[PDB]
């Protein structure tokens, strides 16, 4: 509660805000926290795709593409995740295949990593959107 209200009332602390709020899976909120800075977009685009409004997803991916050269290691994954969920609600089993394959091409290059490194459940995040994609 307080942590939100401080985020309103800061951006490094607001980074902490969005981080903790995504951590409590409160996507149905973060969609509404500050839909109307860079380390925040993943936080945002996730809930954007997660809840499932065709208009909200549209607006979020719109700001994302409006950036000049994101270039960033992170967002493009969630970006594709969403950018499939336009073709779904507009029915192209070809466009969707193209974008989801491009999702594979991404995930299997950068976020994917070395072999073992001490953990599995930690990677389960990276792997679990993968599973659901299928």
């Amino acid at each position: 509660d307080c942590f939100n209200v401080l985020g309103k009332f800061d951006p490094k602390t607001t980074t902490r805000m969005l981080k903790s709020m995504y951590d409590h899976q409160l996507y149905s909120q973060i969609i509404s926290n500050s839909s109307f800075v860079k380390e925040w977009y993943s936080i945002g685009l996730e809930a954007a795709n997660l809840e499932g409004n065709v208009q909200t997803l549209k607006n979020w991916v719109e700001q994302i593409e409006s950036l000049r050269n994101i270039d960033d290691r992170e967002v493009l994954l969630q970006y594709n995740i969403a950018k499939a969920l336009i073709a779904i609600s507009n029915e192209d089993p070809l466009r969707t295949q193209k974008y989801i394959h491009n999702s594979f091409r991404l995930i299997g290059t950068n976020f994917i990593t070395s072999s073992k490194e001490t953990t599995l459940l930690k990677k389960q995040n990276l792997l679990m959107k993968l599973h659901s994609l299928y």
């Binding site: 593409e65 000049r68 994101i70 493009l76 974008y99 991404l106």
Partner: protein
């Protein structure tokens, strides 16, 4: 026999015309009007901006700021004055809009649409000082975007195409770079179309160096080439040729130019020309440095040449919300843009034909330029021109004729002109040819000559029937256009006055016979004869020529 005065026109003032035209222009392809596109612009990350009584607030209407400046300066300036004033202001604009860390450049291209509409509008007595101001400003703008035309030769195994997938800033800078080179094009051609008097006053070695930077950036030999910039750059080379063939003592501008730079241009022309035409995948990616593949990434007209699908046009409109003053463009899919009818592919076959027209056309032009020799004057012109002649002879006959597609007509008119090129060589330039060169390729030149020396049978027509049969076999597409044209689009294609129905028949006869690889012009064969059958070099003494004579009959 006087004719009376006619001053009672309600004359539209030239300044007023210019004003209203800019004020409501819509570009070829989009949906929205220029000035109002402008009216949906805010320049944000530069919270104040100002050069010359041209304040703009932070969240201010860019577009209204335009129309303001426009109208106020209207009752100030005359036509040309209004041009140069805009040019300076918009120039300062673009320059800073460029030099800025977090600034997005949405406005820039659209203002470049301005650039065109504007500078094109009336180039009559416009002065090269202003022209060059804009010009240099944009060349070095380009070197501010020199980070484009030298992107690598291919996508490396590690280099990914996983992407924000935006066609936005790609199309952004693509429009930018192109439109900018397109400036280069347009203003430089307004230079060429200015009175000859106002010429050398603009040409300094700065033109050589700046355009040298951009050319090297552009017609890469170690990166991806990029067909549009390929175009633009090479016609600027053509602009050089133009000032050559136009300045009575063009030796002035030639001496201005540097030998190394003539080389770094003509050599890269060779790099261009020994590529190939394959409508098979003109619309995908293949062996590089060999295919001018205009991909959807940059496929529209270009600010002149109405090349085809122009498939980006309305997507220009989709760039602004067309409802709200804004700074960064509206999203577009990189891939929705672009099996139905490859007739667009064949429109383009005609166009890339016009391109290789340009290739041989500039090479002809420089040919005639250098009545005296030079350093890049080396004979590899003879080699490679004859070489292209050979290849579009042999592969001509084995592949491209008979494929019922009207590309062949221009594909052959090409080499029919190269005939003039070589015949120019025979008349003029046979006081340099190196034994080195003649016996490095005794092969291909003799091939070229004998290609019509075996054609000179001159023993085909004799009737209508066989050739009209040839026609029914091949000329299907050519007749599709022939009948569209005779049935749709001509004054002369009705009411033949009884002296041209025979023109129909024999002209179609000659065109179809000239379609099937054989019996080229009597002028062709005798002009080629005056080259080989004349013994000016020891290609053909009888002792080693009668084996070909008998191989023709004789």
């Amino acid at each position: 026999n006087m004719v009376p005065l006619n001053p009672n026109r309600i004359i539209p003032d030239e300044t007023s015309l210019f004003l209203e035209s800019i004020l409501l222009h819509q570009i070829i392809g989009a949906d929205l009007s220029t000035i109002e596109i402008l009216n949906r612009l805010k320049l944000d990350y530069i919270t104040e901006f100002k050069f010359k009584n041209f304040v703009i607030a932070k969240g201010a209407p860019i577009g209204k700021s335009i129309v303001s400046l426009l109208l106020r300066c209207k009752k100030t300036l005359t036509l040309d004055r209004f041009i140069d004033t805009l040019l300076e202001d918009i120039a300062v604009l673009i320059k800073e809009i460029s030099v800025h860390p977090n600034e997005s450049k949405l406005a820039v291209p659209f203002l470049v649409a301005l650039m065109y509409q504007i500078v094109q509008f009336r180039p009559s007595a416009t002065h090269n000082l202003a022209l060059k101001d804009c010009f240099l400003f944009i060349c070095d703008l380009i070197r501010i975007y020199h980070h484009v035309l030298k992107v690598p030769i291919h996508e490396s195994n590690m280099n990914l195409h996983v992407e924000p997938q935006i066609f936005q800033y790609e199309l952004i800078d693509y429009l930018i770079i192109s439109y900018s080179f397109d400036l280069l094009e347009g203003i430089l051609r307004v230079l060429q179309s200015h009175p000859k008097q106002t010429y050398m006053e603009f040409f300094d070695e700065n033109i050589l160096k700046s355009f040298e930077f951009v050319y090297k950036l552009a017609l890469t030999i170690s990166y991806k080439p990029m067909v549009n910039v390929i175009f633009s750059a090479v016609e600027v080379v053509n602009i050089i040729t133009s000032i050559i063939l136009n300045m009575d003592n063009s030796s002035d501008l030639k001496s201005l130019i540097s030998g190394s730079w003539w080389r770094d241009c003509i050599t890269r022309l060779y790099a261009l020309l020994e590529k190939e035409i394959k409508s098979g995948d003109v619309y995908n990616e293949n062996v590089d440095t060999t295919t001018l593949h205009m991909s959807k990434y940059h496929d529209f007209f270009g600010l002149i040449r109405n090349i085809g699908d122009n498939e980006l046009g309305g997507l220009i409109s989709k760039l602004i919300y067309t409802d709200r003053l804004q700074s960064v463009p509206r999203v577009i899919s990189k891939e929705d843009i672009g099996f139905t009818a490859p007739i667009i592919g064949y429109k383009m076959e005609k166009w890339l034909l016009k391109l290789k027209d340009e290739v041989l056309n500039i090479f002809e032009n420089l040919l005639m330029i250098y009545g005296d020799d030079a350093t890049i004057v080396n004979g590899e012109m003879l080699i490679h021109s004859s070489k292209f002649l050979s290849r579009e002879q042999a592969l001509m006959i084995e592949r491209y004729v008979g494929q019922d597609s009207p590309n062949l007509d221009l594909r052959c008119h090409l080499i029919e002109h190269t005939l003039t090129i070589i015949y120019r060589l025979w008349k003029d330039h046979f006081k340099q040819l190196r034994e080195e060169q003649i016996k490095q390729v005794e092969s291909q030149l003799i091939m070229s000559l004998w290609r019509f020396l075996v054609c000179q049978t001159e023993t085909v027509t004799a009737n209508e029937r066989e050739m009209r049969d040839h026609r029914h076999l091949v000329d299907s597409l050519h007749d599709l256009t022939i009948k569209d044209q005779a049935s749709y689009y001509e004054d002369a294609f009705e009411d033949l006055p009884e002296y041209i129905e025979e023109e129909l028949k024999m002209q179609l006869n000659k065109r179809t016979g000239r379609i099937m690889q054989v019996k080229y012009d009597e002028k062709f064969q005798e002009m080629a004869r005056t080259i080989l059958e004349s013994k000016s070099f020891d290609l053909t003494t009888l002792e080693e020529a009668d084996s070909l004579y008998i191989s023709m009959g004789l």
